[PDB]
Amino acid sequence: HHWGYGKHNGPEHWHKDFPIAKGERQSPVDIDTHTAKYDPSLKPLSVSYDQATSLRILNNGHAFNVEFDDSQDKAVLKGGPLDGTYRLIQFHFHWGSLDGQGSEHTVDKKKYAAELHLVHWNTKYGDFGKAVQQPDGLAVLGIFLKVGSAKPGLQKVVDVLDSIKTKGKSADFTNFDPRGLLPESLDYWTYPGSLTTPPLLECVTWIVLKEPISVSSEQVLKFRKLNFNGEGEPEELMVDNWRPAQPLKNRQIKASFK
Ligand SMILES: CCc1cnc(SCC(=O)c2ccc(Cl)c(S(N)(=O)=O)c2)nc1
Ligand SMILES: [Zn+2]
Structure with a gap:
């Protein structure tokens, strides 16, 4: 009886196996755009993906992970609120059963259809596994998805999903x-x-972009043709694999703009 995305094993149960679920800096959160503080000290984000080596795509039973070679200083996030360099290791998405839900972060209570997480670890801890034990170990660039025009650069991902x-x-x-x-x-x-x-x-510094990307209905419908269950096991469509907004507690959300 391990964790997942349902009534008896979903988010509201996670605390029993993982008591940090009720901690002081849990994610996601609602982003109240009026109260977020513009911080003129924040730097432009530096996203340098010119050398990214993707390797493999994996259905891990919760979502699918796009994996990168993180053994060289290839794809890096830096600047923004960050010190030092963070290396791209993978991405994945969270999405809904319906277009009106699916994101983890919300913006003035708005849910998006999905949310992309590009996960990076701080090079000063040597690999991902040591980084997650540190308060500044990870940086995630989050990007909302809305349904509208197709994302041409997403199509290669969508077309491999039938194989996983x-x-x-x-x-x-x-x-x-x-x-x-x-x-x-x-x-x-x-x-x-x-x-x-x-x-x-x-262990995460969250960096959530304000501008969503558009994907087509057809693209998100293909995400929804995945299963939570194993092969030769009854079909459980991979949908509503999002954690709701958590208490902000003693935190400030900062804005890079306006
Ligand atoms: C540490 C052991 C670990 C971490 N994640 C998973 S499944 C979700 C996943 O791969 C993942 C990994 C890293 C991050 Cl940062 C996030 S998310 N959803 O917060 O971006 C999700 N399983 C085991
Ligand atoms: Zn995620």
């Missing part, structure tokens, strides 16, 4: 350029938080 339908399946996935997922503006909000999945470790 069920938990534990993987496929080779080389030469994918994550730059084709970045909205036009890098204006952002930032705050200290956590992983949104167990183990819920409080």
Whole structure:
């Protein structure tokens, strides 16, 4: 009886196995745009994905992860609110059963259809596994998805999903350029938080872009054709794999803009 996305194993149960679920810097949160503080000390975000080596795509039974070679100083996030350099290791999404829900962060209580998380670890801790044990170990660039026009740079991802339908399946996935997922503006909000999945470790600097990307109905419908269950197991569509907004507690959300 392990964690997932349902009534008896979903977010409201996670605290029993992972008591940090009720901690002081949990994610996601609602982003109140009027109260977020413009911080003129914040720097432009530096996203350098010119050398990203994608390797493989994995259905891990909660979502799908696009994986990158993180053994060289290839794809890096820096600047913004960050000190030092963070290396891209993977991305994944959270999405809904319906277009009106799916995001983890919300903006003045607005839910988006989905949310992309580009996960990076701080190079000063040597790898991802040591980084998650530190309060400044990870940086996640979050980008909202709305349903409208297709995202041409997303299509290569959508077209491989039929090959990873069920938990534990993987496929080779080389030469994918994550730059084709970045909205036009890098204006952002930032705050200290956590992983949104167990183990819920409080190691993340969140950087949430204000500008969503558009994806088509057809693209998100293909996300919704995944299963939570294993092969040869009864079908559980991979949908509503999002954690609701958590208490802000003693935190400030800062804005890079306006
Ligand atoms: C630490 C052991 C660990 C971390 N995550 C998972 S599943 C979700 C996932 O791969 C993941 C990994 C990192 C981050 Cl930062 C986030 S999220 N959703 O907070 O972006 C999700 N399983 C085990
Ligand atoms: Zn995530």
